[PDB]
C-alpha cells in the first residue's frame, strides 16, 4: 500500500475528517506509518491534531478489520511513549475498545490490542489498575486458554506474556491480589514454555510478584515455581538468566522457609558460575542474593559453606565491581552476625580478612560500617575460643591495623567509635 | 525469530 508513505499531519487530518469510511482509512494507516517511523515520530502532532477520539472510534468498526488495526497501531505507538502521551491515549477512551477487540477473530488485530493495552498498563500503577478495573484479565487469559501453548503464533504468544507481564509490575501499590490469583496459574504455564523470549517475560513477571513483603512472595512460592526458577538460572540466555536470579534474590529476601525452597530446589549449586559470571550485574545480584541467604539461619548458612560458596565470596570480596565488593561484605557481616563459631572459623580460613581489610580504603562510609561490624563479629569468635591474638597478629600481617587506626580519625562518627573500640579492645 | 523485549516498559512497534 503505497500512497501512504510520509503523508502531512494536516493531510492525515483532512483524510479523518472526511465522512469516507475508506478515505479515512487511508489516512489512519499514513498516520500509522509515521508513528511508526524510526526517528522523532511526531507523536505530540498527531495528538494536538485532536485525532486520538478518531482513532479510538475506529477501534469500534467491526465491519473494516483494516481500520480497527491500523488505528490500533497508531495508538499503541502513541501509548509507547511517554506518560503524557499514553494519558492522552487513556483519555480518548481507548481502554475499553481495546479490550474489546482482544475477541477480535482477526488474529493480528486481537494482538494489536493486546500490545496497546501493555503500553498502557506499563505506564505505572494507576493506568495497570484501571486496565484491570476494565476487565482486561479475563479476556487476555481465555486467549491463552489452550492445551498447548504452542500451537499459538510465535509473536502472539511473546505479546501476551509480555503484557501479562506489565500488568504484574510495579510497586506504589502492587497490583490487586485477586487479579494476581487470576494471572498465576498461566503465568507458571508460561514459564514451563520452550521459546526463550517467553520465558524472560515470564522471569520478569515472577520477579515484579515476588517484589515486595512475604505474602505476596508466599503466593508465587505456593505455585510450585521455585525449581523451575532455579533450572531457568542455568539459562545460558542471559535476558533469561537475569530475571531469573532477580526473582530467587526476592524470594530469599522473605521467610526462611521460603529461602529453604530455593535451597531445596538446587539454588546453590549455580551460585560458582553466578558469582563469577562475566556480566557484572549478574555478579551484583548473585551476590546480593548470597548475602539474604548468609543471612538466614545457622542450617542455611552450613549449606552455602558445604557447596563450596564461602571461597567465592572471598573471591568477589578480594576482585569485582566496587557495587558487587559491597554487597558481598554484607554477605560476609550477614554470615558473621548469625554464624556458629565454627562457621566463623572456617570464613577466616578460607581467608576472608586480607581482602575484607583491603576494603577499608574505600571512601564509602556505609561499606566500612559493614565490614567493621564484621570485624567485631570475627573477634567476638575468637574471643570464644582465646585466639583473639592470632587475629590481631593476622590482621597487621596484611596492613590492617593500619587501615584501622586511620579510620579512628574518620568524619563518620559511627565509623570512628567502632573503630577506636576495636584498637583498644584488641590491640 | 529473535526479538528479546528486555524488561521493556512500552514498545514501539517498528515497520
Same mark, same amino acid.
Given at each position: 500500500n503505497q500512497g501512504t508513505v510520509n503523508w502531512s499531519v494536516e493531510d492525515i487530518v483532512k483524510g479523518i475528517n472526511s465522512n469516507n469510511l475508506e478515505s479515512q482509512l487511508q489516512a489512519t494507516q499514513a498516520a500509522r506509518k509515521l508513528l511508526s517511523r524510526?526517528?522523532? *515520530?511526531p507523536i505530540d502532532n498527531i495528538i494536538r491534531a485532536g485525532l486520538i477520539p478518531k482513532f479510538v472510534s475506529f477501534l469500534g468498526k467491526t465491519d473494516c478489520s483494516p481500520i480497527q488495526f491500523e488505528s490500533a497501531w497508531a495508538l499503541t505507538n502513541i501509548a509507547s511513549g511517554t506518560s503524557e502521551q499514553t494519558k492522552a491515549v487513556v483519555d480518548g477512551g481507548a481502554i475499553p475498545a481495546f479490550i474489546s477487540l482482544?475477541?477480535?477473530?482477526h488474529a493480528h488485530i486481537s494482538e494489536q490490542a493486546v500490545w496497546a493495552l501493555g503500553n498502557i498498563a506499563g505506564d505505572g500503577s494507576a493506568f495497570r489498575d484501571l486496565v484491570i478495573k476494565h476487565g482486561a484479565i479475563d479476556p487476555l487469559l481465555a486467549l491463552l486458554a489452550?492445551?498447548?501453548?504452542?500451537?499459538?503464533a510465535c509473536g502472539y504468544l511473546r505479546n501476551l506474556t509480555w503484557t501479562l507481564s506489565n500488568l504484574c509490575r510495579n510497586k506504589? *501499590?502492587?497490583?490487586p491480589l485477586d487479579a494476581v490469583e487470576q494471572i498465576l496459574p498461566t503465568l507458571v504455564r508460561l514459564l514451563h514454555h520452550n521459546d526463550p523470549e517467553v520465558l524472560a517475560d515470564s522471569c520478569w513477571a515472577i520477579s515484579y510478584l515476588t517484589d515486595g513483603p512475604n505474602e505476596r512472595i508466599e503466593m508465587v512460592v505456593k505455585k510450585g515455581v521455585v525449581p523451575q526458577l532455579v533450572k531457568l538460572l542455568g539459562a545460558t540466555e542471559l535476558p533469561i538468566v537475569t530475571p531469573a536470579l532477580r526473582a530467587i534474590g526476592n524470594i530469599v529476601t522473605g521467610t526462611d522457609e521460603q529461602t529453604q525452597k530455593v535451597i531445596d530446589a538446587g539454588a546453590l549449586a549455580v551460585f560458582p558460575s553466578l558469582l563469577t559470571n562475566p556480566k557484572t550485574n549478574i555478579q551484583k545480584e548473585a551476590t546480593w542474593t548470597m548475602s539474604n541467604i548468609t543471612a538466614g539461619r545457622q542450617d542455611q548458612i552450613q549449606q552455602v559453606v558445604n557447596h563450596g560458596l564461602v571461597p567465592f565470596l572471598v573471591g568477589v570480596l578480594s576482585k569485582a565491581d566496587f557495587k558487587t565488593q559491597k554487597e558481598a561484605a554484607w554477605a560476609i557481616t550477614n554470615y558473621t552476625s548469625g554464624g556458629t563459631v565454627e562457621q566463623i572459623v572456617y570464613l577466616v580460613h578460607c581467608g576472608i580478612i586480607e581482602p575484607l581489610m583491603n576494603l577499608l580504603s574505600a571512601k564509602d562510609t556505609k561499606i566500612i560500617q559493614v565490614i567493621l561490624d564484621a570485624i567485631s563479629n570475627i573477634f567476638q569468635a575468637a574471643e570464644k575460643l582465646g585466639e583473639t591474638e592470632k587475629l590481631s597478629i593476622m590482621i597487621e600481617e596484611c596492613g590492617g591495623l593500619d587501615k584501622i587506626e586511620a579510620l579512628?580519625?574518620?568524619?563518620?562518627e559511627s565509623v570512628y567509635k567502632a573503630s577506636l573500640n576495636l584498637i583498644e579492645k584488641y590491640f | 525469530e529473535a526479538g528479546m523485549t528486555l524488561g521493556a516498559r512500552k514498545l514501539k512497534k517498528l515497520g
Open positions: 524510526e526517528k522523532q *515520530p482482544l475477541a477480535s477473530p489452550v492445551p498447548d501453548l504452542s500451537t499459538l506504589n *501499590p502492587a497490583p579512628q580519625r574518620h568524619e563518620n | -
